[PDB]
């Protein structure tokens with residue numbers, strides 16, 4: 001690996017540990033290459049926090065010099081991560097709060113109390129599936145049987161996605177996220193997803209129900225109402241995020257606890273909270289690797305560095321979770337007892353901070369203890385260190401997770 005001043009992010013995710021350490025070492029601001037496209041990566045905790053609140057960094061792709069010049073187009077395999085419709089995800093400034101408010105109100109801890117029974121029912125159902133799958137000592141994929149379906153069920157219940165449509169959504173997302181999907185097919189899948197959620201919003205407009213989509217469509221009376229584009233945009237964002245991140249969180253938490261059985265014991269015996277184990281998982285091995293992307297509306301002076309107007313800026317959240325300045329020398333270790341376990345920014349910071357953090361945390365806090373209580377001798381049927389990532393550049397997406405129920 002001969003010295004380079006640009007760090008190429010390997011889209012096959014062949015050396016995530018090496019790559020994450022190289023980003024930390026090269027940071028807190030360093031040049032990266034995303035499939036032939038240059039950007040800056042923010043890899044330090046403090047600098048990330050400053051920049052995530054800097055109003056000169058915007059989501060709007062039309063602020064991107066390479067987009068303005070036509071240098072980057074829809075042929076770029078990562079383009080679907082940023083060139084999306086109007087929503088809380090793409091907006092900044094005073095307009096942004098309007099696009100967030102119904103969702104944040106709906107996803108408060110207290111409002112989520114009402115969704116808890118549903119989450120509990122789905123966890124119980126999928127554990128029944130695990131039991132069936134793992135009978136007579138057979139090897140089971142913890143991902144396909146338990147972790148992969150659960151968050152789709154949950155976010156679907158919340159948004160009003162029919163039971164019978166969820167399999168198709170998962171199929172689309174898998175194609176959408178895989179770097180291997182041919183770009184023409186990925187763009188088709190993106191159109192097909194948009195068509196689906198467009199019709200879903202038309203369905204809920206004609207016949208509203210007790211779900212968040214209906215609430216985005218029909219606001220309290222006072223308004224002003226969200227456009228069709230905004231409702232669909234929020235909808236797609238909530239489902240995509242709600243599913244994809246949460247799967248990873250469940251799987252990494254299990255892998256972390258199973259490879260650190262002494263720390264699994266701490267949570268089982270009630271000496272450390274499950275919630276604390278989940279925070280350290282978010283810090284150490286969290287759902288987001290990189291977040292695309294922000295752009296400078298003008299020059300941003302950082303004292304001994306300048307991010308030029310038009311430049312693309314990525315938040316390298318995995319690298320950021322391994323910040324030694326913040327977490328100490330053992331940042332690269334999983335340690336649910338560390339003082340800084342909950343001091344991560346793995347859900348972001350500033351205006352665009354994750355609105356679903358309480359739901360993510362709640363799903364994990366129900367699912368994890370339920371899994372280990374039900375199957376106390378759960379163990380890997382494959383060395384945990386041999387579980388590969390899927391080729392998904394921006395997301396910490398585990399391929400499969402072979403276990404035995406034990407015993």
Ligand code: HEM
Nearest residue numbers: 088089237238241242245246287346347348352354356360
């Ligand atoms: C489970 C683990 C999760 C992690 C690690 C996570 C992480 C994040 C991060 C880091 C951002 C902001 C990126 C940035 O602006 O720099 C974010 C934004 C967002 N997340 Fe979460 N998230 C999680 C679960 C969820 C869930 C359950 C939902 C929905 C129910 C969700 C919906 C969103 C939406 C809609 C945005 C965009 C908000 C905005 O830009 O204003 N994510 N997520």
Ligand SMILES: CC(=O)[C@H]1CC[C@H]2[C@@H]3CCC4=CC(=O)CC[C@]4(C)[C@H]3CC[C@]12C
Nearest residue numbers: 080081082084089236237240241245288
């Ligand atoms: C940080 C993270 O993993 C989540 C939070 C917001 C999510 C994005 C929300 C908007 C969105 C809509 C889509 O239709 C494609 C997926 C994307 C582009 C999502 C990709 C994963 C993101 C980036």
Ligand SMILES: [K+]
Nearest residue numbers: 083084085086
């Ligand atoms: K578009």
Ligand SMILES: [Mg+2]
Nearest residue numbers: 003004005006
């Ligand atoms: Mg050099």
